[PDB]
Write a protein that binds this ligand. Structure first.
Ligand SMILES: CC(C)(COP(=O)(O)OP(=O)(O)OC[C@H]1O[C@@H](n2cnc3c(N)ncnc32)[C@H](O)[C@@H]1OP(=O)(O)O)[C@@H](O)C(=O)NCCC(=O)NCCNC(=O)Cc1cc(O)cc(O)c1
Ligand SMILES: CC(C)(COP(=O)(O)OP(=O)(O)OC[C@H]1O[C@@H](n2cnc3c(N)ncnc32)[C@H](O)[C@@H]1OP(=O)(O)O)[C@@H](O)C(=O)NCCC(=O)NCCNC(=O)Cc1cc(O)cc(O)c1
Lengths: 421, 147
């Protein structure tokens, strides 16, 4: 064995190499190659080590799959129990304080870690269920929401009404560009909607924009905040992975609660149907969202796209779900070639259920909400999602994604492009 | 139009004519008419009709022009700044104001430049082939930005 011993050395070899070497972006060609080869040797051992001990490394962190740990708590606990395997909060604070172009790419190690974990028929499912449990922040807010029916947050406005959980993305100044805080609010909101007995159906829509170019008009989503990403503010674990295993997965499978109510023996997770209403446009992570709703409406002037065909990161789980909606040809036209799909063209019905003139939209959205109220919709929706996406499929995809994305999150072509927005 | 006759020699020489509602420019054999009321999304009015007809007349009378193109230009209004907009129709404000003329606007555009887009301009018997083509017509291309 002695793989740990080896890794600890490869890591040390790197850790000390960075202390003597000059600051990133001031290094010479011979220097960049040395630190590069060092990281490479370190990372290769991380894979080799986990390929045979991932389960043991995980059993120790979760007391043999007896304690559920969300993504952040897992990697943090991994950092302290296995120095060198993944970056400490400290190592990561230094990284988060540098613009993307100058990071050492320590997150990649977390990518290596989560891939091995997720690949296990034992740990992966356990980690997924962990992410399906309600956020502690939502539990805190649950009593006040059940009473007020209102919760204002930084990126989302939640309001209960007529049995509908109305989530409104309200970053009026940046066309709802996504960031870490938006993911926390989205998950918090989704958790509240699913935990409130007063809520029967959920609705996600964008609110009025204040920016001069869209003043007075609604805009669903302009995707990830490219400025922050360039700035080094987009977290692999806390943003990219958290949204896929968190609130987006809960939109599909609901929230795993404790055995604390009747029927839990047949429904451990509380799920509910969701409606998405797209105003203006849905780009990137926003268009990504759509592949998970029970109902989708859009105003006649909107379009859908995953633009970074060139130099972008992987469009989340779209590579996993789009084929199902559009077939492999259109799927590759949208993601590999960047084809944008307008609401009024025939193929938009592969993604949207209903397209309406902006002055008929609100009415159509209301009518949509009231058609998904019953228990028949709940049963049917659960069986359909079960057939459309299996536990293994989602898991295997999210496994390779963890790493593949980690790598794209530090690709020179991506960093460069993002720096020009 | 008499106004086009006046401007014909200067257009044949410069290949450019700036007007209040339209910008005409000859290039690569193309008569490029640009509706440029950047502040009101090219809302139509009496002056725009005079310019449109004047422009169409010039395009059809210039031997240097083979094909015509009509397009809207960049808007300055905050809601469309930097983007092109073809036409938002008649100026509703003026119409309310009593500034839309039945004869000079509504009828003039239909029997004037719009009919010339279809049948060309009837000239005098002052050139060969006039016996088989009294009107000079040319093909037109329209490019619509925004709406
Ligand atoms: C939407 C637009 C076409 C609008 O054009 P316009 O009408 O020309 O408005 P603009 O003047 O450009 O922008 C209005 C306003 O919003 C801001 N804006 C617009 N888009 C953005 C983004 N993406 N981030 C931040 N701010 C933005 C823009 O900076 C303006 O403010 P100012 O810069 O101060 O002027 C434009 O903003 C644009 O091209 N944005 C690029 C959209 C984009 O490419 N997003 C990339 C998406 N890529 C992903 O989501 C990747 C991803 C996301 C995920 O969530 C998960 C995942 O796994 C992968
Ligand atoms: C185009 C619009 C939808 C744009 O919406 P927005 O993005 O909301 O821009 P807005 O803020 O409304 O307008 C931008 C700007 O352009 C101005 N604008 C827009 N449309 C017009 C019109 N039609 N006239 C004058 N000014 C206009 C508008 O007043 C704004 O400036 P401010 O008032 O100071 O704010 C809106 O402007 C609009 O609804 N215009 C109504 C368009 C219309 O109905 N035209 C009526 C057409 N009816 C005919 O052409 C009839 C006709 C014409 C003929 O030529 C011949 C004939 O026989 C018959």
């Amino acid at each position: 064995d002695g793989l740990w011993a080896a890794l600890t050395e490869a890591a040390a070899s790197v850790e000390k190499l960075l202390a003597t070497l000059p600051e990133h972006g001031a290094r010479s060609s011979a220097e960049r190659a040395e630190i590069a080869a060092a990281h490479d040797a370190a990372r290769a051992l991380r894979v080799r080590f986990l390929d045979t001990h991932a389960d043991a490394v995980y059993d120790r962190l979760t007391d043999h799959r007896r304690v559920h740990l969300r993504l952040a708590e897992l990697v943090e606990a991994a950092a302290t129990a296995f120095p060198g395997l993944v970056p400490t909060q400290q190592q990561l604070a230094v990284e988060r304080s540098l613009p993307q172009a100058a990071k050492e790419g320590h997150e990649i190690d977390q990518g290596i870690f989560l891939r091995a974990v997720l690949r296990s028929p034992l740990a992966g499912p356990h980690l997924l269920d962990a992410m399906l449990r309600p956020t502690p922040r939502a539990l805190e807010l649950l009593p006040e929401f059940v009473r007020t029916g209102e919760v204002e947050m930084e990126a989302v406005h939640l309001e209960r009404r007529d049995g509908v959980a109305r989530l409104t993305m309200c970053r009026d100044d940046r066309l709802n560009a996504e960031d870490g805080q938006q993911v926390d609010d989205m998950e918090t909101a989704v958790d509240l909607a699913l935990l409130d007995p007063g809520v029967r159906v959920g609705l996600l829509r964008g609110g009025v924009m204040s920016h001069p170019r869209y003043r007075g008009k609604r805009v669903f989503s302009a995707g990830i905040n490219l400025k922050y990403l360039s700035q080094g503010g987009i977290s692999l674990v806390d943003f990219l992975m958290r949204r896929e295993l968190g609130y987006i997965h809960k939109l599909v499978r609901g929230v795993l609660t404790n055995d604390d109510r009747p029927g839990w023996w047949h429904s451990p997770r509380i799920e509910k149907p969701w409606v998405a209403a797209v105003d203006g446009f849905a780009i990137g992570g926003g268009a990504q969202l759509l592949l998970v709703f029970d109902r989708v409406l859009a105003s006649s002037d909107a379009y859908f796209s995953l633009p970074a065909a060139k130099e972008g990161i992987i469009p989340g789980a779209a590579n996993l779900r789009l084929g199902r909606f559009a077939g492999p040809r259109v799927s590759r036209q949208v993601i590999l070639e960047g084809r944008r799909i307008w609401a009024k063209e025939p193929e938009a019905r592969l993604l949207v259920d209903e397209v309406v003139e902006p002055d008929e939209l609100d009415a159509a959205i209301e009518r949509s909400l009231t058609r998904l109220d019953g228990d028949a919709v709940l049963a049917n929706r659960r069986m359909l999602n079960l057939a459309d996406e299996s536990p293994d499929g989602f898991r295997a995809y999210m496994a390779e994604f963890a790493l593949m994305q980690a790598l794209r999150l530090y690709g020179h072509d991506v960093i460069d492009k993002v720096g020009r927005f």
